[PDB]
A paper describes a structure:
Dog and cat DHX9 were selected for protein production, as each was highly homologous to the human protein with sequence identities of 94.4% and 94.7% for the full-length dog and cat proteins, respectively. Interestingly, the cat and dog DHX9 constructs were found to have higher melting temperatures (dog DHX9, 58.7°C; cat DHX9, 60.6°C) than the human construct (57.4°C) and the melting temperatures of all constructs increased by 1–2°C in the presence of nucleotide and magnesium (data not shown). Crystals were obtained in the presence of ADP and Mg2+ for both cat and dog DHX9. Both proteins crystallized in space group P43212 (one molecule per asymmetric unit) with extremely similar unit-cell constants, despite differences in pH, salt type and the amount of salt in the crystallization conditions. Additionally, cat and dog DHX9 provide additional crystallization systems that could enable iterative structure-based drug-design efforts with validated compounds from DHX9-focused hit-finding efforts, assuming that the compounds bind to the orthologue proteins.
DHX9 [DExH-box helicase 9, also known as RNA helicase A (RHA) or nuclear DNA helicase II (NDH II); EC 3.6.4.13] is a DExH-box RNA helicase which exhibits unwinding activity for both DNA and RNA substrates. DHX9 has been implicated in several biological processes, including regulation of transcription, translation, replication, RNA splicing and processing, and DNA repair.
Residue numbers in the entry: 273 to 315, 321 to 588, 606 to 1150
Write the structure that this text describes.
């Protein structure tokens, strides 16, 4: 049915006024009501590109490669190469004397399997422009190889001819390795070992250094070029992170046009053919250590040797003959869509019976299943405090709490690790004798025309199960407990689909064009494994649609801003808009918070009472998050203990808030550096109960940014998608009712943030909006019949024709002004009166009073 949209009469008077002042014409009402006239409107191009290459140069005196700038004051700034080489050679032998715990550790370094091969490696790397270092996970190629390379260059007095960039796919890997390698050198991060992840960096010195960054960070610094670098180490290639696959394309163009450069690809035990063939049949340096085999078992065997009982074709129904009558009878009572918490619980205390000491590594998909499984054991008898030691490893936990997994345990105690697939190839634990495998992955599923980053649990590869097994048996003959039928193993993929095949490419596309590497399609066609066509088309369509590219597929001044922002391009455009309305700080804050988990500490079930009160009366998860942020930033002014007090009292995660903050600041600086003034990015206090026109527009711009994640409320926990299918409220949301209950809303229009798919479908992080916001920013294709209005062809609205089409115009005028200010962002100071009245009209229609709503 439609919605009874009740505007004022003198408001409609205003919307037609401004539209006249802007010298634009409203699409007239249909003569025949059955004619579905569309309200949408629409509206210099630049010369095209040619296939080009990122420039390279080796390390230089008076050039910091980590700040990508000159240095005209200090020892190195003034000194000569040999001076530095000599000096630094001495510093280490000075250090060698005086530190009495350094050689304590350096011996530990030489016990690592990769130690053996140091000669062969350095030998290969020297004589070949590209190298692959294949070897098992645990040999120590991550930590050691970049040292081996530096150590050598130091003690041949070529220290200043050495700068190493080491890319890691995960944020956590980059930093924690940087920490480890700096420890193994008797230092703290900053001396010779730096890092650089998204929104956080501890840079090293300009010479004889090692930089551990993420691929995205490196890619966005390549506008300056790969200047002042001797070696480029691309670790964990076998993971097939889409950004690594992309980087490899870039690097291959480099090694052609600059063969002096040195590249080092590092991989687990997989087929490295395509990589070797890609890089001109480059040498492979195999690496291996003394490792023990493992008996692996499957979900038949697990139930066999515990006597367990619980309360696409199903593979649990299929079972072997030699397995007993009760074995089958049990397993078939348990679907494969969810992993059995109850079985693995019983499977742990079977390991007791084997009476062999060691740690059990449990593979699960996601924080959700790890945090539940933890509270399943820890808050349960048998599993006492002094019997078992249950450590989680999400990569979303304090980095102190991560390290626990490595250091040993008091004797007669079992160390249980509930980790993600980080521990599959990225990190190795020492005590691991046993492994339990969910045989499942957590992947963002996003195909063409989804426009929804949808997290979904899926089956792992045969290769995955193989690699998860090998974690057991780095100490003694081990055991591996696969929680998948023997039938389900047969119906598994051998390898998993690489990210290139199943990820958006609009971020990759902006990069391509910023770096002037040629055409989006042409470039990705050179990939080790190119993406599907429709993905490239979708990426191209998507960037054109928001004027990041012209129709000639070249980078507009807007797209450049979006290229320099390290966030989703829509949120980048949302921020630029907010700057124009002088709500830049507010809207950057929301952007930043997308890059981090929710700062609420949910004990389980749904949300609590006190947390929901941050929402206010705007029925918004986004305002909940924005309200805590205001309360936190005010409370932090007390001091360190005052900050944590607040957080402890309100049950908030203090780490998350400091990260969202630091990210907000960094976003803010890119806009400042882009030319936007300071005054449009100042902190602006707001209420979440009274009226707030600053916060009205901020909700409006959130409608834009999060489009097209829209829904409509009907029943208590029922909502309907944009397409029309039936979805739910997530239990974390503030707009979620309590069990059985319901709540009325001043509007059923919600722009939601994210959608999970594990048990069913559901929407997460919901924010209420008015009809006018839906029309103005959260709806592309809209049709009028004179009285009734159709929005994105599944949402109907009873409303004036002239007003509905006057709004769709403002949008088009706003988009025009976006273009205008992206040519010169300092424009927003001296805005012509027509423009500033267009911003006030938008401000007006943002409010709920103008849509016949009040929040009480
Ligand atoms: N933070 C750490 N604390 C203690 N030991 C560590 C740490 N990081 C790595 N190790 C140890 O270093 C060894 C090699 O690690 P790494 O260089 O990551 O290997 P690779 O990447 O080749 O699998 C492993 O045996 C592991 O136990
Ligand atoms: Mg590694």
């Amino acid at each position: 049915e439609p919605y009874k949209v009740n505007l004022s009469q003198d408001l409609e008077h205003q919307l037609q006024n401004i539209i006249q002042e802007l010298n634009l014409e409203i699409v007239p009402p249909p003569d025949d009501p059955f004619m579905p006239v569309v309200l949408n409107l629409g509206k210099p191009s630049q010369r095209q590109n040619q296939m080009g290459v990122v420039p390279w140069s080796p390390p230089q005196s008076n050039w910091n490669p980590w700040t990508s700038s000159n240095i005209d004051e200090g020892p190195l700034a003034y000194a000569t190469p040999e001076q530095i080489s000599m000096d630094l050679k001495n510093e280490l032998m000075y250090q060698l004397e005086q530190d009495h715990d350094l050689p304590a550790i350096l011996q530990e370094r030489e016990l690592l399997p990769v130690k053996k091969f140091e000669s062969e490696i350095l030998e290969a790397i020297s004589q070949n422009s590209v190298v692959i270092i294949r070897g098992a996970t645990g040999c120590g190629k991550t930590t050691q190889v970049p040292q081996f390379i530096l150590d050598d260059f130091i003690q041949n007095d070529r220290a200043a001819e050495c700068n190493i960039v080491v890319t890691q796919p995960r944020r956590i890997s980059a930093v924690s390795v940087a920490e480890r390698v700096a420890y193994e050198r008797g230092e703290e991060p900053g001396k010779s070992c730096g890092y650089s992840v998204r929104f956080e960096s501890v840079l090293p010195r300009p010479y004889a250094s090692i930089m551990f960054c993420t691929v995205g960070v490196l890619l966005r610094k390549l506008e300056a070029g790969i200047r002042g670098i001797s070696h480029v180490i691309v670790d964990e290639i076998h993971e097939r992170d889409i950004n690594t696959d992309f980087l490899l394309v870039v690097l291959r163009d480099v090694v052609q046009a600059y063969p002096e450069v040195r590249i080092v690809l590092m991989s687990a035990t997989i087929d490295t053919s395509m990589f070797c063939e890609y890089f001109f049949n480059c040498p492979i340096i195999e690496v291996y250590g003394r490792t023990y085999p493992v008996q692996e078992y499957f979900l038949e065997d697990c139930i066999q040797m515990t006597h367990f009982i619980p309360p696409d074709a199903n593979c649990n129904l299929i079972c072997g003959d030699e397995y007993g009558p009760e074995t089958k009878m049990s397993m078939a009572q348990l679907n494969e869509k969810e992993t059995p918490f109850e079985l693995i619980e019983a499977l742990l205390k079977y390991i007791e019976t084997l009476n062999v000491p060691g740690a059990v590594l449990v593979f699960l998909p996601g924080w959700n299943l790890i945090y539940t499984m933890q509270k399943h054991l820890e808050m349960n008898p048998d599993f006492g405090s002094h019997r078992y030691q249950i450590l989680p490893l999400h990569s979303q936990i304090p980095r102190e709490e991560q390290r626990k997994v490595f250091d040993p345990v008091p004797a007669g105690v079992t160390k249980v690790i509930l980790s993600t697939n980080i521990a599959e190839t990225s990190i190795t634990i020492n005590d691991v004798v046993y492994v339990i495998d969910s045989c499942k992955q957590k992947v963002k599923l996003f195909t063409a025309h989804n426009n929804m980053t949808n997290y979904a649990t899926v089956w792992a590869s045969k290769t995955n199960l193989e690699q998860r097994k090998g974690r057991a048996g780095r100490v003694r003959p081990g055991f591996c407990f696969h929680l998948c039928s023997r039938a389900r193993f047969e119906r598994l993929e051998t390898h998993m689909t690489p990210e290139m095949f199943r990820t958006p490419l609009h971020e990759i596309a902006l990069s391509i064009k910023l770096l002037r590497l040629g055409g989006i399609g042409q470039f990705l066609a050179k990939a080790i494994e190119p993406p599907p066509l429709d993905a490239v088309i979708e990426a191209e369509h998507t960037l054109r649609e928001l004027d990041a590219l012209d129709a000639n597929d070249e980078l507009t001044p807007l797209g450049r801003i979006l290229a320099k922002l390290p966030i989703e391009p829509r949120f980048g455009k949302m921020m630029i808009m907010g700057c124009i309305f002088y709500v830049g700080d507010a809207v950057c804050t929301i952007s930043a918070a997308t890059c981090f988990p929710e700062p609420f500490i949910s004990e389980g079930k749904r949300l609590g009472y006190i947390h929901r009160n941050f929402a206010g009366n705007r029925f918004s998860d986004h305002v909940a998050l924005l309200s805590v942020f205001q309360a936190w930033d005010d409370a932090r002014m007390g001091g360190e203990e005052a900050e944590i007090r607040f957080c402890e009292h309100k049950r908030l995660n203090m780490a998350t808030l400091r990260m969202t903050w630091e990210a907000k600041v960094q976003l803010k600086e890119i806009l400042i550096n882009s030319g936007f003034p300071e005054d449009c990015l100042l902190t602006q206090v707001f209420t979440n109960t009274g009226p707030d026109n600053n916060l009205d527009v901020v909700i409006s711009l959130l409608a834009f940014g999060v489009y097209p994640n829209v829904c409509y409320h009907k029943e208590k926990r029922k909502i309907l998608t944009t397409e029309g299918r039936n979805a739910l409220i997530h239990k974390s949301s503030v707009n979620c009712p309590f069990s059985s209950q319901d709540m009325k809303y001043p509007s059923p229009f919600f722009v939601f943030g994210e959608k999970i798919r594990t048990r069913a479908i559901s929407a997460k992080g919901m924010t209420l909006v008015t009809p006018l916001q839906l029309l103005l920013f959260a709806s592309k294709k809209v049709q009028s019949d004179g009285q009734i209005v159709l929005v994105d062809d599944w949402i109907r609205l009873q409303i004036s024709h002239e007003a509905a089409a006057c709004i769709t115009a403002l949008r088009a005028a706003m988009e025009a002004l976006v273009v205008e200010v992206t040519k010169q962002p300092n424009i927003i100071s001296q805005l012509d009166p027509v423009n500033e009245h267009m911003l006030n009209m938008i401000r007006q229609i943002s409010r709920p009073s103008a849509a016949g709503i009040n929040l009480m």
